[PDB]
Amino acid sequence: KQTGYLTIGGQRYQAEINDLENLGEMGQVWKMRFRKTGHVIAVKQMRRSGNKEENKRILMDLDVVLKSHDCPYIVQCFGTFITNTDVFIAMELMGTCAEKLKKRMQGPIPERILGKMTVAIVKALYYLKEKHGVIHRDVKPSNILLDERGQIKLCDFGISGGCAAYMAPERIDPPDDIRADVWSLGISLVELATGQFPYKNCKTDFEVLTKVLQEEPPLLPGHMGFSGDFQSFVKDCLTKDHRKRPKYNKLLEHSFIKRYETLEVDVASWFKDVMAKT
Ligand SMILES: *Cc1ccc(-c2[nH]nc3ccccc23)cc1O
């Protein structure tokens, strides 16, 4: 409920827009450096004359983000700057998203990294539903952020209350709710674990939808050395009948989640080695 201030790492700094140097573009997102400390941050510029639809989704994503300060698996907001013509939203800068990480990798992402990712994203979605009654509705690799510090976080929620390729069967053919995001996460995990989107050779959005309904769930291959727990977690996420798909409280008890809650995985070192191979 305050503006003109940046809170980074518990410390509050009085700030204006002029205290920030524009380091280039990444709705408009800028990479920017806070001159008072050297902190490099991401800054969204919501123009007052901008699109009402985009500005609505920006204000909606910010509203959820401001509520999520006590969740370590959601990208955080440092503060805002309100001028006569713009609103600048200061977000913590992450390294990349899982989609760009897949293309730069040009291959499968290891299971040990996807386990830490599954833990963070499931706890992020569980926090959203339980603490704020929020359903994400658009879980996909481009909304999973990772940084050099090893952190994995879910990012801005324009549609928090959808991409066709990750729609659950019950969103395509509604019987007439969080479990639909469980399906999207299962599809993202298969895509990131194989390096290939599961429903291949689709030229239209509708063709993707027919494959989600007409074909069996695209589970993990049994010849990549995937652990039995990982294959079990994916198969549960990809249960086509949503009435039997597990909710978040049951997924959080899964042995796949329990292993990577306590297992030391150096996501930071693996992340910097991948990005070094540009
Ligand atoms: C490729 C890439 C790089 C950075 C980010 C990112 N870092 N912090 C963010 C806050 C809000 C939205 C996006 C952010 C994303 C991304 O895809």
Author numbering: 117 to 142, 148 to 282, 295 to 309, 316 to 417
Authors' text:
Covalent binding to lysine involves challenges such as the increased pK a of the side chain and its considerable flexibility. We prospectively validated these protocols by designing and testing a new lysine-targeting MKK7 inhibitor.
Our results suggested that installing an aldehyde at the para position of the phenyl ring and replacing the acrylamide warhead with a hydroxyl group will allow the ligand to bind Lys221 of MKK7 covalently (ligand RMSD = 1.3 Å and ring RMSD = 0.7 Å, respectively). To validate this prediction, we synthesized 1, incubated it with MKK7 (Overnight, 4 °C) and measured its binding via intact protein LC/MS. As the aldehyde warhead is expected to form a reversible covalent imine bond with the lysine amine, the mixture was reduced with NaBH4 (5 mM; 1 h; Room temp.) to trap the covalent complex prior to LC/MS measurements. Significant labeling was detected only after the reduction of the complex, which correlates with the reversible nature of the imine bond. Compound 1 was confirmed to covalently bind to Lys221 using X-ray crystallography. The crystal structure confirmed Lys221 as the binding site, despite poor electron density at the covalent linkage, it showed a large movement of the lysine side-chain, which is pointing away from the ligand in the original cysteine-bound structure, indicating the formation of the covalent bond. Elevated b-factors and the electron density map indicate flexibility and/or lower occupancy of the ligand, additionally this partial occupancy might be the result of the reversible nature of the imine covalent bond, and reflect partial hydrolysis of the bond. Comparison of this structure with the predictions from both of our protocols showed close agreement to the obtained structure, with some minor differences, such as our ligand-side protocol placing the hydroxyl group at the opposite side of the ring, resulting in a slightly higher RMSD value of 1.8 Å (0.5 Å without the hydroxyl), and our protein-side protocol showing a slight rotation of the phenyl ring. However, no experimental density was observed for the hydroxyl, hence our prediction might still be accurate.
